[PDB]
Structure 1
Amino acid sequence: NPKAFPLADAALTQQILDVVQQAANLRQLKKGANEATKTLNRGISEFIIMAADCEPIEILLHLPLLCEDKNVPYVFVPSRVALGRACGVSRPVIAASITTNDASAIKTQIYAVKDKIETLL
């Protein structure tokens, strides 16, 4: 898929899914395509993780428009099943959004991974 342009390599996926898992435990994370779109419209999203093997790809390809329109970093990971396991819900999630909070224990990791994604863009 060339439409999934920024696709993470292995180590980048590992870092991203670890940050997603910590953000889910702290509950700084919003799961699902519609909930991620709502966070983006609210302007409270830190950054966007999407799946790549979603069936099909357009139903979340609607997101990069809003993503760089409000200038939010976004990334694609290969497996929506991996994304669901990392989010910590029993169903495969195709798009998750780390929100913004600075009274948060994982601010440093969030900023590191967001910087690395932005460099990949």
Structure 2
Amino acid sequence: NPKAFPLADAALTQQILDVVQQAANLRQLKKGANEATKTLNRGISEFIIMAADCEPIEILLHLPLLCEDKNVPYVFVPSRVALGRACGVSRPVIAASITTNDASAIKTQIYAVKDKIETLLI
């Protein structure tokens, strides 16, 4: 899908599934693009992870528009089953959101991965 941009390589995909998996431990995750849309409206999201092979893709494309509205970074990852399987749910997730805490123990990895994404957008 040429619409899937910016699309990631292998190692960044493994790192992002890891950080998502650790946030999925600490009850600090929002699942489903509906909830992620609500977090983007309420302004509480660090960033948005969206499955690139989501068929049909029409259900997803508004989120990066509102992302660059509120200046919130985003990354496409090429498979949904590893995403929702990394969220702790036994059904596919196509888009998920990470929330914001000034005392969460995984903060440094969040900031580093955000720096990778701001490298990807430029």
* Matched ranges for 1:1-121 at <5 A: 1-121=1-121
Instruction: State percent identity of aligned pairs.
Output: 100
RMSD of aligned residue pairs (Cα, Å):
0.7
Would you say how many aligned residue pairs link Structure 1 and Structure 2? Answer: 121
TM-score by length of structure 2 reads: 0.96
Structure 2: gaps spanning 5 or more residues? none
CA distance in 1, matches of 2:24, 2:102: 16
**SS of residue in 2 equivalent to 1:119:** helix
Task: Using structure 1 for the length normalisation, give the TM-score.
Answer: 0.97
Query: What is the deviation of 1:8?
Result: 1.1
- Residue 103 of structure 1, CA deviation: 1.2
User: What's the offset of the Cα at 1:99?
Assistant: 0.7
CA-CA distance at 1:2 after TM superposition: 2.2
Shift of 1:95: 0.2
Partner secondary structure for residue 98 of structure 2: strand
**1:40-98 C-alpha deviation (Å, 9 max, x unpaired):** 00000000100011111120111111111000000000110010111111110000001
Residue 82 of structure 1 aligns to a residue in which SS?
helix
Give the whole-Å Cα distance in 1 for the aligned partners of 2:9 and 2:58. Answer: 22
